[PDB]
Amino acid sequence: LSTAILKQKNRPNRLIVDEAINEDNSVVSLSQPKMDELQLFRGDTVLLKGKKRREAVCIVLSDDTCSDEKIRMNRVVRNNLRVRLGDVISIQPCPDVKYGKRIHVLPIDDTVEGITGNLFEVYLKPYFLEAYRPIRKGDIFLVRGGMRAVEFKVVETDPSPYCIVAPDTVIHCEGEPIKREDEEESLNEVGYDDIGGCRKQLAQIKEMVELPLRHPALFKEIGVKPPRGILLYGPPGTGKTLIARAVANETGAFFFLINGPEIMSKLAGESESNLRKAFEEAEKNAPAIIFIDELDAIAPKREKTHGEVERRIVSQLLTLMDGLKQRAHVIVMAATNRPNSIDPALRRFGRFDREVDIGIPDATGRLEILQIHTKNMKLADDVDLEQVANETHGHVGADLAALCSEAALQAIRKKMDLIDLEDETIDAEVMNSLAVTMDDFRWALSQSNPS
Amino acid sequence: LSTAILKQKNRPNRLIVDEAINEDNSVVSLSQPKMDELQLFRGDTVLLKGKKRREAVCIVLSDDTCSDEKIRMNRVVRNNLRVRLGDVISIQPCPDVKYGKRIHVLPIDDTVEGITGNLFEVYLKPYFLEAYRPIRKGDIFLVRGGMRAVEFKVVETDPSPYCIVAPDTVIHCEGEPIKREDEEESLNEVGYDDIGGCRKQLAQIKEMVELPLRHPALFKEIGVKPPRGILLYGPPGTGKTLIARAVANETGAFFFLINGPEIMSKLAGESESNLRKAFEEAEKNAPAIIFIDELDAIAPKREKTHGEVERRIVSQLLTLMDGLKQRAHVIVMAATNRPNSIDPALRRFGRFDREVDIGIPDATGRLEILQIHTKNMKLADDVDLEQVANETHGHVGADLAALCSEAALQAIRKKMDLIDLEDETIDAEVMNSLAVTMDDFRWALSQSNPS
Ligand SMILES: Nc1ncnc2c1ncn2[C@@H]1O[C@H](COP(=O)(O)OP(=O)(O)OP(O)(O)=S)[C@@H](O)[C@H]1O
Ligand SMILES: Nc1ncnc2c1ncn2[C@@H]1O[C@H](COP(=O)(O)OP(=O)(O)OP(O)(O)=S)[C@@H](O)[C@H]1O
Ligand SMILES: [Mg+2]
Ligand SMILES: [Mg+2]
């Protein structure tokens, strides 16, 4: 009703992700009745939009066994789009794709332990030979070559970001293997889905940041100026910084992050350069979102603040906030857990003149969060999160995370007589037996604390 | 029950140290019934793990008189392993030992006062001749040669850290004699055993620091992220720094120490370099433990702190704490006796978000400590520590240490009419007569003070 901006719409080309029949990386299945509706001929190269602004490039074919409003893609494709089976994507005609000049691709470290021989010969040459594949920068794809299957990451393409791999395409694969861990972190980067119990506020954010930038005309037409300063506040630990993350990954804009405590670590005047440098960068690449985390760290009350360089920064900032031209297309977001200590001049109209309170979560919010956290944890069947939710009154996001971490330990703890700290490696059986029992939670619960 | 991680396990090759029958440095006794269980043939060269990460290398033989789950070793071996008779060790097959290229060994100063003649000839040559001994770097071993017995320290081996001494091995013993005192300090280096009345906390430390680093997979498997900031706090003098010591010596990890008061003694900016330098060192050598002693000295409340360079450091640190990547494998530990004066931003989730309170010890704790202290003191038989323990209410670790030091003096005091300060040397008889009577304690006790 007021959460309207969130419920996404039934549209011609929003299709649910079904498991693939055809097993090929560059292939996507569609019902014939659909392919026509979207004016899509066979072997056409298409563009796919996923989550967290991830993109994939594929070739399209008709599947008899595929529902109209469903689409098949393998796990490699589900990965680049960052979607689980049952999620929904945008399909779009990608007609002007150019042939590939040169591509640079590296293998993942934990998929090459063993023989080198020749990676191009054994793996890449055949996978690409006479295939004419579409690929995007930052695609991770798997190639089987006789005895092994190896994962490769598309480091660079000419032309960026996408090209077709033709016979003329020079393929470079020399370099240091990509580290798995980094690419683990990359998958794990926070989306909107990863924040819980903030629907109301999430709405406002999109309404004040995402919307004014994606569709500036709605405001033009109606004849009003969008606000340009948004200040999130909340009792400590409520996913303010966490939202900072989501937006960066999720937003269509050029994003620049500023960390109060990090600014203030610089030499006198070194900070003023960085402060300008940020605002200049943002203008140069507009539309942009500048985000200031822990604002209070750089904007105490000038009157009540002791150091001299210290006031200069509040002044320095104020100036920049004000120095933003209308045509600039920059929204400054920021966040504190102590709003009242921030110099009031910054909350004057035309500066940070919009607030999003990010309060304690209620019963269902806790349940939401608990779900988001445990989504990759090993839990016993006897674990009831609704219970936890109810028993966790006054917890916030960070309190809950802690709770989970604690029970997890307690679980690990129950294996601690079976294991000695000294051992070089752990008995592989027990490892698999390990799970967080509901009892583990009740222990963690018995230990919990105020926010 | 929650101290589970501490109780060590019955295992195939955890054997109790029994006094040796065979008197040789390179020899270890085992029951035949055991030797088989561990697939260990006679004259095999084995690896032995002691306390505080000490290691010894020996040759193994069967003893008829030796219990299955016991092992015999002489005092020289008990010394390199840093164990008293009745302690327990790891025995491990050491199969790939290489022959010794060159070894450098020096004698101990207070074991060579007198004739030189030739140390190699009289002592080393025979002890090694046709023996094929296993030795480790940092072994101290004793050699008898006619009239005298001399102690040698293995300064360097090629290949490090262990090699077999064959006839081909070139032996260098030229140099300045090792100073006894240094090697006294070395034996005395604080282990875990040296801290008393903290079992509960000692547990949490291992649980939070040693465990996440030694076995990162338990958390991976269960799908939780270990915490990376641990803050120890306690009323002054409760072995916070003392634990700092233990961990350094005891840990598997690369360890880097930071002393608040020592950081703050540096020129402006000269501290910031060191702070980074430390965090960089730790990343470079991960897995690592960075330890910050007297944290409050560098992290007062930014709001409540006066100097400018002074806030810059709190900011500087915060940044680094945050700048720690997931893949980094670094746990930051720190300690204060004034937790409440530390800037709260540092106790936010994902920074120092775990506390270990190191509190006053109870009756038995005191008794524990009193034992640990007096372990190398000359005490009369009439001395009842249980008494002391009961009478010392409200004392902490440092209070007790003081007490002992005070009674010791009182004891020395009782010899003070027999002795004049002026004398060049002390009557050697009285020296031996000296011991701390229980009365001495009752005096010290009568003088004691609040913490
Ligand atoms: N609303 C939420 N949904 C899901 N997880 C959350 C939420 N809030 C906090 N968390 C978890 O707790 C961690 C800390 O949250 P942050 O966003 O750093 O808190 P914060 O509100 O920025 O705290 P301050 O004000 O800087 S002390 C996050 O990394 C999440 O894992
Ligand atoms: N738990 C303990 N077990 C054994 N000895 C202790 C213990 N606590 C203190 N001591 C002795 O007292 C000395 C001082 O202890 P420290 O570890 O320096 O105290 P601390 O807790 O670091 O004090 P602060 O907070 O820096 S004033 C140590 O060197 C020990 O000899
Ligand atoms: Mg934050
Ligand atoms: Mg101390």
- Which spans in A234-328 are helix H? 240-250, 260-263, 270-284, 308-322
Asked if the A1-96 domain carries CATH number 3.20.20.390, the reply is no
CB contact under 8 A, A409 and B5: no
Check if A287 contacts B (Cβ < 8 Å): no
| B207 close to B3: Cβ distance less than 8 angstroms | no
Chain B hits for A432, CB-CB cut-off 8 Å, are 221
Alpha carbon A160 to its chain centroid, in Å, reads: 21
Q: CA of B354 to nearest chain A CA: how many angstroms apart?
A: 10
Check if A420 contacts B (Cβ < 8 Å): yes
| Rounded Cα gap, residues B355 and B367, in angstroms | 26
**CA B1 – ligand 3 centroid, Å:** 36
| Rounded Cα gap, residues B345 and B353, in angstroms | 10
User: Ligand 2 test: best mutation among B202, B238, B357, most atoms within 8 Å of CB?
Assistant: B238
B138 labelled as ligand-binding?
Answer: no
**CA A273 – ligand 3 centroid, Å:** 24
Q: CA of B83 to nearest chain A CA: how many angstroms apart?
A: 17
| Rounded Cα gap, residues B233 and A259, in angstroms | 29
- Please give the number of the atom of ligand 1 that sits closest to the Cα of A242: 17
Q: How far is CA A367 from CA A361, A389, B135, B204, B331, in A?
A: 9, 5, 61, 29, 30
Q: DSSP letter at B55?
A: E
Residue A441 CB: number of other CB atoms within 10 A?
Answer: 28
| A134 close to A99: Cβ distance less than 8 angstroms | no
| Rounded Cα gap, residues B285 and B249, in angstroms | 17
Residue whose pair of structure tokens reads 């989306």 in the numeric block = A191
Tokens read off for B12? 């195939």
CA angle B239/B243/B245 to nearest 5° reads: 115
Task: Give the amino acid at B95.
Answer: P
| Rounded Cα gap, residues B12 and B4, in angstroms | 20
Sign of CA dihedral A355, A361, A364, A366: positive
| Rounded Cα gap, residues A31 and A66, in angstroms | 5
Check if B269 contacts A (Cβ < 8 Å): yes
Residue whose pair of structure tokens reads 């509901």 in the numeric block = A438
**CA A330 – ligand 3 centroid, Å:** 22
| Rounded Cα gap, residues B278 and B284, in angstroms | 10
Tokens read off for A126? 């055949």
To the nearest 10°, report the CA torsion of B35, B37, B40, B41.
70
| Rounded Cα gap, residues A94 and A441, in angstroms | 50
Which residue(s) pair with A194 in the sheet?
none
CB contact under 8 A, A436 and B222: yes
Tokens read off for A70? 């469903």
**CA A379 – ligand 3 centroid, Å:** 29
Give the DSSP per-residue string, B167-219: TT-EEE--SPPBPHHHHHHHHHS--STT--S-HHHHHHHIIIIIHHHH-THHH
Buried-state track B183-210, b at ≥16 Cβ within 10 A, e below 16: beeeeeebbbebbbbbeebbbbbbbbbb
Nearest to A417 among B7, B319, B353 (CB): B7
Q: Which of residues 5-44 of B touch A (CB under 8 A)?
A: 5, 7-9, 11
Q: What was the elucidation method?
A: X-ray
Q: Which of A110, A245, A265 to mutate to test the interface with B (most CBs of B within 10 A)?
A: A265
How do the residues of chain A divide into helix, strand and coil, expressed in percent and rounded to 5?
35, 25, 40
CB contact under 8 A, B223 and A376: yes
| B150 close to B107: Cβ distance less than 8 angstroms | yes
**CA B249 – ligand 2 centroid, Å:** 16
**Which residues have CB under 6 Å of ligand 1?**
A 195-198, 234, 236-242, 294, 337, 369, 372, 397-398, 401; B 348-349
**CA B79 – ligand 2 centroid, Å:** 26
CB contact under 8 A, A408 and B219: yes
Q: Is the beta carbon of B97 within 6 A of some atom in ligand 2? A: no
Q: DSSP letter at A296?
A: G
**CA A240 – ligand 1 centroid, Å:** 6
Q: Please state which CATH number belongs to domain B97-189.
A: 3.10.330.10
| Pairs across A and B, CB distance < 8 A | 106
- Resolution, Å (one decimal): 2.6
Task: Tell me, letter by letter, the H, E, C secondary structure of B347-415.
Answer: HCCCCCCEEEECCCCCHHHHHHHHHHHHCCCCECCCCCHHHHHHHCCCCCHHHHHHHHHHHHHHHHHCC
Chain B hits for A421, CB-CB cut-off 8 Å, are 5, 206, 210-211, 214-215
Three-class DSSP category at A336: strand
| B136 close to B77: Cβ distance less than 8 angstroms | no
CB contact under 8 A, B348 and A237: yes
**CA A360 – ligand 1 centroid, Å:** 11
Q: Is the beta carbon of B401 within 6 A of some atom in ligand 2? A: yes
Alpha carbon A397 to its chain centroid, in Å, reads: 18
Single out the residue of B293, B295, B263, B286 nearest to residue B276, CA to CA.
B263
Alpha carbon A403 to its chain centroid, in Å, reads: 24
Give the DSSP per-residue string, A136-194: ETT-EEEEEETTEEEEEEEEEEESSSEEEE-TT-EEE--SPPBPHHHHHHHHH---STT
| Rounded Cα gap, residues A202 and A345, in angstroms | 26
Three-class DSSP category at B91: strand
Tokens read off for A183? 């690419």
Asked if the A360-451 domain carries CATH number 3.40.50.2300, the reply is no
| Rounded Cα gap, residues A159 and A119, in angstroms | 23
Three-class DSSP category at B248: helix
Q: How far is CA A233 from CA A78, A126, A296, B376, B439, in A?
A: 36, 55, 11, 59, 65
Q: Is the beta carbon of B195 within 6 A of some atom in ligand 2? A: yes
| B94 close to B79: Cβ distance less than 8 angstroms | no
A135: phi then psi, degrees, rounded to nearest 5: -140, 150
CB contact under 8 A, B4 and A413: yes
Check if B214 contacts A (Cβ < 8 Å): yes
| Rounded Cα gap, residues A360 and A23, in angstroms | 46
Chain A hits for B312, CB-CB cut-off 8 Å, are 264-265
Chain B hits for A268, CB-CB cut-off 8 Å, are 308
Q: CA of A88 to nearest chain B CA: how many angstroms apart?
A: 26
Q: Please state which CATH number belongs to domain A190-359.
A: 3.40.50.300
CA closest to B307 among chain A residues: A307
Which helix (H) or strand (E) segment holds residue A14: the answer is: strand A14-19
B3 labelled as ligand-binding?
Answer: no
Check if A189 contacts B (Cβ < 8 Å): no
| Rounded Cα gap, residues B82 and B86, in angstroms | 12
Residue whose pair of structure tokens reads 């260098």 in the numeric block = B172
In sequence order, what are the residues at sequence separation of 6 or more whose Cβ sits closer than 8 angstroms to the Cβ of residue B84? B17, B78
| A334 close to A231: Cβ distance less than 8 angstroms | yes
Q: Residues within 5 Å of ion ligand 3 by Cβ?
A: A 241
Q: Which of residues 309-368 of B touch A (CB under 8 A)?
A: 311-312, 314-316, 318-319, 322, 325-327, 345, 348-349, 353
Kindly identify the ligand whose nearest atom is closest to the C-alpha of B451.
2
Task: Give the amino acid at B82.
Answer: R
Task: Give the amino acid at A276.
Answer: R
B364 labelled as ligand-binding?
Answer: no
| Rounded Cα gap, residues A355 and A309, in angstroms | 28
Domain-by-domain residue ranges, chain B?
1-96, 97-189, 190-359, 360-451
CA angle B388/B393/B394 to nearest 5° reads: 135
Alpha carbon A190 to its chain centroid, in Å, reads: 4
Q: For ligand 2, atom 25, which residue shows the shortest CA distance?
A: B236
Binding site: residue ranges of A?
236-242, 337, 373
Q: Which of A378, A383, A422 to mutate to test the interface with B (most CBs of B within 10 A)?
A: A422
Nearest to B218 among A181, A377, A412 (CB): A412
Using only C-alpha atoms, chain A has a radius of gyration, in whole angstroms, of: 26
Alpha carbon A357 to its chain centroid, in Å, reads: 22
- Please give the number of the atom of ligand 1 that sits closest to the Cα of B350: 14
